[PDB]
Amino acid sequence: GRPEWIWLALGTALMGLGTLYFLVKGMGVSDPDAKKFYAITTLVPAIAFTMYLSMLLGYGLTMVPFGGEQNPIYWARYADWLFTTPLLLLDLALLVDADQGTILALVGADGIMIGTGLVGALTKVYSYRFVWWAISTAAMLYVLYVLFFGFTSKAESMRPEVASTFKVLRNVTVVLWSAYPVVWLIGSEGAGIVPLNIETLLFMVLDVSAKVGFGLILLRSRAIFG
Ligand SMILES: *C/C=C(C)/C=C/C=C(C)/C=C/C1=C(C)CCCC1(C)C
Numbered sequence: 001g002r003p004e005w006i007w008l009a010l011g012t013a014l015m016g017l018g019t020l021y022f023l024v025k026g027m028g029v030s031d032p033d034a035k036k037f038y039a040i041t042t043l044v045p046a047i048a049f050t051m052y053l054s055m056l057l058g059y060g061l062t063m064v065p066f067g068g069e070q071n072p073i074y075w076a077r078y079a080d081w082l083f084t085t086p087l088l089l090l091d092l093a094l095l096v097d098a099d100q101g102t103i104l105a106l107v108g109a110d111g112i113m114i115g116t117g118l119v120g121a122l123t124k125v126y127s128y129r130f131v132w133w134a135i136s137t138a139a140m141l142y143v144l145y146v147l148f149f150g151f152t153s154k155a156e157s158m159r160p161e162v163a164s165t166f167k168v169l170r171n172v173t174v175v176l177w178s179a180y181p182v183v184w185l186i187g188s189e190g191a192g193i194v195p196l197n198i199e200t201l202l203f204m205v206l207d208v209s210a211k212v213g214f215g216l217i218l219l220r221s222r223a224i225f226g
Pocket of ligand 1: 081084085088113114117118133136137140177178180181184207210211
């Protein structure tokens with residue numbers, strides 16, 4: 001009965017409720033273009049719900065020795081993020097009619113981000129954990145650069161309503177995503193300053209905002225309609 005369980009429980013509830021709501025709304029829509037955004041966006045909190053639930057029930061946690069101690073590491077987070085982060089990026093790419101090659105590069109970079117983050121999280125030599133963290137953060141910054149510079153450029157060719165919706169979601173994404181490496185650095189996976197219970201809270205707030213919040217903004221907009 002780990003003290004972070006309460007945030008895993010609340011996370012499970014919020015992702016579950018978000019999923020159900022998006023599913024109800026999405027099943028009701030008949031516009032083909034809107035249905036695509038609903039499918040992608042409903043899947044995001046659906047995956048997160050399954051991983052939060054698994055963690056709540058005591059799975060996706062392993063002990064990694066570093067710094068002379070046995071450290072608890074929630075590896076299930078990375079299984080969630082491996083699939084949900086590219087899905088969020090795909091929502092943004094569809095909104096701005098991004099090029100196929102841009103999408104492949106973004107999804108590639110995002111995979112490197114999550115994959116190297118996981119390797120870092122599991123690494124037994126303390127200093128090397130941070131090498132992997134740095135690589136992961138570089139991949140993240142590539143993603144954010146492309147969203148901020150590249151996608152905004154593409155968005156300029158869309159109707160103002162679509163461009164406006166994209167900018168809100170872009171802004172939400174940059175603010176929330178940029179916090180993740182800092183939480184990792186100061187938390188259980190990194191410097192061990194912020195205790196696991198508080199870190200779980202922080203990741204829960206970030207995750208729910210980045211998936212359910214993002215989804216609410218996108219799915220209530222006229223931008224998703226063809
Ligand atoms: C729904 C979940 C979202 C939007 C998660 C985003 C997660 C990141 C942007 C994670 C980035 C990381 C780094 C930049 C380096 C350290 C470890 C990673 C996975 C946390």
